[model samples]
Target chain A: GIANLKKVLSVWESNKLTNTSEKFWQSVLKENTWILSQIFSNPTVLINDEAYVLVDFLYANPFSKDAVLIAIKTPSTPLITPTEYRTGVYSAHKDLTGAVTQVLTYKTTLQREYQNIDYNNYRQGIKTDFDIITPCCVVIAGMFDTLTDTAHRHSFELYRKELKNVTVITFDELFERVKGLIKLLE
Target chain B: QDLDQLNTLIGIANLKKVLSVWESNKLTNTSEKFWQSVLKENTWILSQIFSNPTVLINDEAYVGGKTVKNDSGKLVDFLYANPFSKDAVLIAIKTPSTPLITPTEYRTGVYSAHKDLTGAVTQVLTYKTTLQREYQNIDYNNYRQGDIITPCCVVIAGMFDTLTDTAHRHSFELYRKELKNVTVITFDELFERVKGLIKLLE
Candidate 1:
């Protein structure tokens, strides 16, 4: 799976090396939904069929049916760093904190408008059996180096834990851990 | 509203200040017993700490708080249940001086910590596991809705001030990840939250 993800990422990187657009990352994940879904669970990843949605990737736990929201980004994106992300060093991009906030916003709206949201999701071919209680948020981008230092990592850990249902993982960190399995495949 | 009841707010502030003093004053190590009593006496203050409804501090400390019995079979510090969720929350109070994590051992990125911190975490999680295990045998009065699968467990210990360096803070972050259901809140963090709440009320 790691090798497959690495290969897909390399392809996506090559594709985007020239043309940079807001929807490029989304398109990459959308085109390779099967491999992207492996981050959370097995078999396949569930794509949110809505034409317009805050989350880029959505995977529901097979057993619990809890929806997991994932926000993907490129390594150079300003949202990956705490200083840039939190201070809004760049006015155009939202930070990791902002991304998690948006996820929570989606959760609140979903809870309040479960009936309509479920109906709309079904209309859009998204799953209706989402477990509201155990919903989670994830951000995938950048590298551990972007965290800067140990204190920054510590702060990020605290922030993630405080959110309870949110997780932040860098593609480089994930790649390093799973590269051994990738080597076996080769 | 009566002024006397409002004075409870003042009392809460006073207690928070005292706790802060206790946290910084490392010369005299405050005992866990003293901290537990302080929490028990001012249980109402927990309302600011926890947002959940019906945050009743169980009076039957000996029985209800004694929900779990391990090898070190004394009662846990405090027990409270959220009537809304039909789930119980166990509280483990530790002195501000307690070490959050041990030094990192070299192999496989293995780490260990002061027995005080680790023991507290183990005990609280043991309580959580035991609660789920004996969910069927337990009586349901305040917790009438159903058994709690993931009963919330909290440990209030250590001062963030002591975590001055990278190593100290990193160890804390790692050990916290190791625990399954426990939420570890530092004394400094809790005090800051309480202060924030107080400001909001003001």
Candidate 2:
């Protein structure tokens, strides 16, 4: 079955990696959240095997429930950094910037409104209390070498450190790691 | 929500009128103790500045009670917390006569110098960190509901009226941006935002 999954990933790598929209990636992940769980080693089983991947999760504190105040984005944009051939000097693009800030914003939202989060509606089959001990917001987009400026990279790392409970990884990195796991399983 | 919003609206209107008269008559000159007394008397003023009336006003945050000191053994200006969040908010007060930005040595577009904004940021952050180290000793488990996040420092000091130049304003923005994990709101800016919010609500 994993062999079939690996081939499906290969089909995505060849056909849809560069040109497809972010929604395409989001749909893929929503349908198969197990791919994401593989990355985090399934932090909680309640969310791991059977949880619905709620896209565009908006978080509002208790006082202003009527007003949907803030939105926390994850995989906000497609990871489309050109890998093989480029001529001009590399600069920061929206893909990298959006990925970084999405993770940061998600973590800040969790920190600000820890008591107000609820996920029971998504998966009613779960019996245990779905309490999040540490909000590990993950963003899967952008390549490491996309930003040629070391200063930009340094700023990105500093933002990650400041956010405390966020993880940012590229699609290629996730796929490569999962491919390795698939090989070991085979 | 309607009642709280109404009360906040009234309080906000009063604050705007008082600040306008105070600033227009060149009556802004004051000492640190005088400003501290003003905040204690009109506690709702700080709530308006913070813009979260529910947490700051409705919940009735303890106004400057806890005794927290830095590693140097000097007691800080003020420390307070609300029941909504386990983390505390520490405040460092300065006066209208004080300077918001230091002279010369601008780095990262901010007037990065000692004994000025940098010193104020360090003082507040250090006070918060020191208090965090001793947080376990307190009976916070019985009091608060949520996990204790890192304490935030709010420094209410200086008058933005004196920082008139474009360069001075830019430098102030840069300094505030650089001061990570701390909110530095000047006296003038705080009042101006409150006034603006009141107008927006009206």
Candidate 3:
């Protein structure tokens, strides 16, 4: 999907549609509240055993009914997995995870295993592929539900690496974590 | 003679102010079209063959005012919705033709979509998603303003929907603040920025 988006974006670049595409993506990312609420509304990634579903809307028109829903439920979810030879921030999903962990602290409501848990550690866990993989990390997902009950409800967890274990952090903490993540990615 | 020419005169003054804003901002083509339409409209009005256009569809937030209330079972036009500021947001284009009406239909659609307590909302979910995309597009921390309306509207709308009817119900106040931030464009400020674009009209 990322490759396909790149293809569409490359075509856009050739045709000078970057601004339009940027604006389109901007609207998709910013104003579309309902989906934003859906995607980030939950505390944990695995809702009903389904992890976060992110679509690469490369070919899908906004007006169309045939929108794609990409869920990383399986351990085989390709893009976010770590490769043995690949290293650094951009190479593996864990690199992003590591970067997120460097800045965030995960706090599970239930510290026990899956049976005692309403949600599992999606950010860091062993994949079914018999490999240790940490999926994409989340800072905002920790308490977005408590902040906006418009999202789904479940036991919450934080990244569990840094900062104090408060139910909610100050605006500066939230801002710092987000800013740090984006900067790390760039 | 009671509710006579004075009201019309006030309307004329308001109309002239609107025109002057357009002209000063170099929105000549739009201004010209409006002038032509108003001329035709007033001509028809003078002939007395036409009553005001009735509301066919009501827009959400269609009634232009800050705070309007019913008094003695009578509806009144109070604060005139600023045309320029109205155009900055999505609701501006969706108002009713009847000045006396609140354009409740458009408002109904928007409000229903945003505040879908029935859990029957769709598509507009995509609209909110688009707003999130808009926020990602902004380099707000970089400290520059360019075409601020689109980004401001999108972000404000996102927070509004985010904070609506949740633990953040007090967020309605934040939403109001966001709306004000977008709409509080000064006349001189707009004139200074947009005056250069006027030459393209010819």
Candidate 4:
């Protein structure tokens, strides 16, 4: 319990609590129209959660106070809501409960990761990655050139990627393909 | 098992560097005693100065200023928060509990108390008996049986309450406005005033 309080205090000190303070919530409402306009620009994308996450991060650890604030304030993970943030914290809280319950759950049948001979081959990739990656791979590789880029931002990346796996088609061809699929179903 | 030995060997290899430095600067017999006496006298002061600026591990680092009043308010605050700290008489301190924990033991005890099973009830009774038995026939006969426990528990409770209060106050005072438009002051520049203090140890 002492350790957990310390952990939360450190995070609180790290500007997390600042985001939840009363003032930021007021500004969020003030800029509600602008936020709404941005959402309209990309109907397929979820914006409210992402906006909340960014706003919370900004409010909590303003770029003025924290230099590293620039890193997380981006389109990279733009969709995180208050509910989502709270849920993540809740998951961590659950993890603490699990650790305590581990003694009760402990059994001889439990396969410790180190004891397991299996899955060694699965862990072989990226074994020599750096301790820290500069410019965040999420921003450069995942968001900019890929997920949130010009070619992919309009539709769900997961769905688009699966569809594109076989071949790329023009709008007319995509329409014709959809029509044929609908006719077959009927 | 293979990696375990490999890591241990690596740790020893790392130690070889520090060992060589120690060997080359080996102190004479006279020097060793002098150093030991200095350490014995001012160990606490030396530790604070030398501790690596390793802040809370998972949280990386954050911008917050230490705001204790020059040992005086700290004493009052510590006394208010932890009677044990008050008892120490020499030092007063505060820190956000680092390395967070989930209190499993407290939870389990609470759960067991609620269950009211024979064995659990017996165990609890034994605990209370032990607490009472510890104070029996002591010189301070008037002191309550659990008086000692009160200070320790109060401190733990006070620490969390205090952290929440201070964290809220700091946010109100200097969250966004303070970090903005601030000049960077390097540690080297700040160290000049303490140059004489550093030299005294040398």
Candidate 5:
């Protein structure tokens, strides 16, 4: 059971709320990888290469034969329809578009350099092979709280649902999914 | 598996923690101690804003501060050296809550930059000049040997919210526009740059 991570998370939560702040999130996540590890038994995490593209975390599942290229964006990712577009307004933020696009861009970048990356791995004798072709990009951003009316939520949801392999889920949704994973795993 | 990777992805996540600190402790958020500790450890936050091929040379940059006229014990924030290029960059930071522009308008739709901001701006430039003069005995990533002859600076100060008026905005626009060599970026805009950091070819 990976209750240790949960406990540590709870500790961090309590410590921040109670005393001051931090056991820190990123370093902790980098170390534990929490749910990702729990689900995949700690698969090889492909830390993003600077030369190509930067992703939040890349989980290359050996058995699953797929890469989980996750993009951790601002939790306060805006969902505003400031202007009334002709009447039924729905113009999402460019930032919102850009955040998701960055992940897809990385996916494309990975595919482009597939041969180069694989060749280097072979030459270096860091034996093994995997395709960087199609990664399931998960963008962790956009909050429900930001959606004032159903209109914004509706538009955002419509955008999210339409996305392929690019699962645009909220921070809260991510937490929920992980918690759900914990329950089932336990 | 051989894991050879940069901390850019892993480093970026600490932004949330940085935000938590800022939100939770707004009063003491921008204190040099708090600011330096977090940013020094997580330099990717700094590097993300800067252009690629940029490398941090030093903190406090004592050499730059040594040449100050009045106070011999002045301070500089961070200095960057590009191993490839001779041109180096300096970073100077001020407290986030510092008001960027004066409240009083000069006339109807124009305002003056606050003394704090203007002073900080001069300090950055002065340090920039100082560093360039006494540049022989310093770390330039082994690539730079002679001197950091060509240098520029970035002054990160005050949140954009400080410029509440359009008049202030116009004046600030003009201020940075007219100002030579130095780039003035608001604290919030620094975060925006961090957010917009992922584009590779752009």
Candidate 6:
């Protein structure tokens, strides 16, 4: 299975199909939540309440009852701004900044929907009712090679450093994390 | 010469790692998936409660994983059958970081339950409902159909240490005792059972 996993990932990573869609990565993630589990523990439920929160998934813990709001972008998306404003300073790309802002917005709007809980609120799946709602937001986008430009990578790291609650990781990082997880087992 | 010694040694190695992770903070990767994999690989500790714990039915995209799915696609965390009757008990897990009771008290004296606590109770019960009503759809490799008459579901969640308040401790104890078919135990308690078992062996 790991071998085939490599095969599918290999083909996908290679962009064998020039046609682009996030659907492939989306299904791959949903089915194998352990990959996402690298960011979130074993978040049981996958929530995409498109009406209220435009999030790819809310990888939630029924026990903690808090969730990690996930917004996934395509692997080929740029991670940082192309131009360096200063000698070494750069900003995140519009795509990166936009994705993160939506994640925060999703949490804000989502919290409005479910502010309190009762006997009826004890149902399975995520309920972000507590004071510290949406403990973290994870924006998964880009790939490992996007940081090829050393100057551009500074903003990627700087942007992440400022974000204490937001965990911004590339899809390639997610894949690499699981690879390391499996490596430990092996 | 060492198959017997090897098991205890392997078990010792496994529990040490599990506990090491447990002792560490949340920054440490204590994901349910991590616990799931370790518990499956070094499952000797689980036998302290469940009889002959075997088989890992995770829905992971990795090797040697099988899942019994409801037609509706609902799934439990793990299922272990009693070796005697081949009847199964479903296990649904939460990390040790799970809250056992509310940080604030409900009534001056009584502490209320956290969603994490009640949520697992409800989750496992619903999983059992699916398993009982939809057993026919599941494959058993000819192990027989009455395999799930009404399973004894178990929910492994938070620790008792989280119930530092006397009222909270009493409420948690009193609440769990009133449950029907499902049994709830804390992550610490699960380890306590194994440590006690090893103590006896020593």
Write model 4 residue lDDT over B54-156, tens digit each, in one string.
1111111111111223344322232333333222211111122211122232333221111212232244334434433543333245445543321110000
Q: Docking quality tier of candidate 5? A: incorrect
TM-score for each model: 0.43, 0.43, 0.17, 0.19, 0.41, 0.48
Better of 1 and 4 by TM-score: 1
State which candidate, 1 or 6, has the greater DockQ: 1
Could you tally the backbone clashes for each prediction?
1, 0, 39, 12, 0, 0
Cα lDDT tens digits for candidate 6, A1-186: 344345546665576225246777677677765456555322234444532234377665433334567887788777777777788877778998899888888777666665343223444444433322334678888865767766777667778767765778887666665444333223
- In CAPRI terms, model 3 is classed as incorrect
Q: What would the TM-score be for candidate 5 when compared with the true structure?
A: 0.41
Score residue A1 of candidate 4 by CA lDDT. 18
Best by TM-score: 6
Write the residue-wise lDDT of candidate 4 on A1-186 in tens digits: 123223433442354323534344334323422221111111111122222111211112111111111111211222211122232221112322232233222221122332332234235432211111011000100122223333233332332233311111122222232232222212
Tens-place lDDT digits, model 6, residues B13-66: 666676675667434655877766656554434432443223222322112222
Per-residue lDDT tens digits of candidate 2, residues A10-71?
85577443544655666666565345444421111213322212234222211111111112
After superposition, candidate 4 runs with Cα above 4 Å error: A1-11, A14-99, A102-111, A117-186, B1-35, B45-202
Interface RMSD of 2: 23.9
Q: Give the clashing residue pairs of candidate 2, or none.
A: none
Candidate 6 stretches with Cα past 4 Å from truth are: A1-4, A16-19, A41-44, A47-55, A115-132, B1-202
> Chain A TM-score of model 1 versus the true structure?
0.67
lDDT of 3 by residue, B42-159 (tens): 3322112112121101122222222223233211111122223312222111111112111122111121112211011111222323444443344353346642223122110121
Error of 5 at B27 (Å): 4.2
Docking class of 1: incorrect
Per-residue lDDT for A19 in model 6?
29
* Candidate 5 displacement at residue B96 in angstroms: 0.3
TM-score of chain A of 4: 0.15
DockQ of candidate 3 against the true complex: 0.02
lDDT of 5 by residue, A1-186 (tens): 244536755754454323411223334455655433332211334544432333366766342234667766554456545664655557777766787889888787877877777677777666433445344677765556667777777777787767755767665554554444333222
Per-prediction DockQ: 0.02, 0.02, 0.02, 0.01, 0.01, 0.01
Model 3 lDDT per residue over A14-53, tens place: 4332232333432433332333223333321222223211
